[PDB]
Amino acid sequence: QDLSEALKEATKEVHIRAENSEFMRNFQKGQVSREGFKLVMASLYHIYTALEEEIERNKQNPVYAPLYFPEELHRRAALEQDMAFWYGPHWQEAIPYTPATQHYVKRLHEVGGTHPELLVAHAYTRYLGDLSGGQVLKKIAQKAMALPSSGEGLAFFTFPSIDNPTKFKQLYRARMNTLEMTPEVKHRVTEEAKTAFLLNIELFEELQALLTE
Numbered sequence: 272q273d274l275s276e277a278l279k280e281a282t283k284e285v286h287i288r289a290e291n292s293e294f295m296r297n298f299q300k301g302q303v304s305r306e307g308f309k310l311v312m313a314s315l316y317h318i319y320t321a322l323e324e325e326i327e328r329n330k331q332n333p334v335y336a337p338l339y340f341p342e343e344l345h346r347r348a349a350l351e352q353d354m355a356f357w358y359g360p361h362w363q364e365a366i367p368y369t370p371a372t373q374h375y376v377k378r379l380h381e382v383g384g385t386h387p388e389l390l391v392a393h394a395y396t397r398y399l400g401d402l403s404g405g406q407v408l409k410k411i412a413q414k415a416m417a418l419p420s421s422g423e424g425l426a427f428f429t430f431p432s433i434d435n436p437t438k439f440k441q442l443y444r445a446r447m448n449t450l451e452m453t454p455e456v457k458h459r460v461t462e463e464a465k466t467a468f469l470l471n472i473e474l475f476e477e478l479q480a481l482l483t484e
């Protein structure tokens with residue numbers, strides 16, 4: 272079975288559970304507010320920072336290299352623009368770093384530093400979602416919070432180097448299928464993707480509790 276398919280099948284159940292996290296339900300209904308949005312986006316800033324440090328560490332390693340798309344996909348510089356927008360000029364000392372965000376970042380460095388053959392699972396789980404549900408969430412955010420169509424504060428959701436997310440996702444899947452694949456790597460990559468999804472769910476469960484505490 273192709274890696275792209277194995278991953279879709281392996282993660283289709285937990286995707287359902289992730290898209291119905293309470294935080295995401297509230298978000299999708301349009302009950303997202305500045306405070307909650309700031310929290311989630313600050314947490315993503317740390318997550319993508321760690322993911323992309325690890326992509327850079329492993330960019331020439333053939334277990335990852337065919338998925339190396341910094342110009343199209345990487346989110347850190349976008350997140351920095353967003354953090355300056357939502358948190359101001361001293362955002363770096365303002366932004367929170369939650370325990371569930373730390374947990375995710377920790378696993379990211381373990382994968383990038385020790386199990387780089389699994390790094391694809393983590394790039395898959397975040398980037399392809401950003402090009403899918405992330406586009407729906409962006410429209411909702413804009414409406415709920417009165418964000419301007421010019422993009423300020425939602426640079427994370429904006430991919431100026433990708434003309435067509437659907438066609439890009441297709442390119443990316445096909446490229447995943449060119450990685451060197453053995454049953455051991457395939458098994459473990461799809462397991463790590465389920466883990467990635469759980470790390471995301473845990474983040475959201477946490478952020479939701481913080482907002483109701």
Ligand code: HEM
Nearest residue numbers: 278279289290295299395396399400403404407440468471
């Ligand atoms: C409200 C929340 C969400 C909605 C409405 C949503 C919606 C979608 C939709 C409609 C697709 C299909 C795209 C396609 O076939 O090209 C998709 C794919 C994806 N989503 Fe989400 N999603 C949400 C949350 C999540 C979260 C939290 C993650 C990960 C943490 C995520 C990760 C993915 C991945 C990795 C894919 C691609 C699956 C594949 O094609 O193999 N999504 N999502």
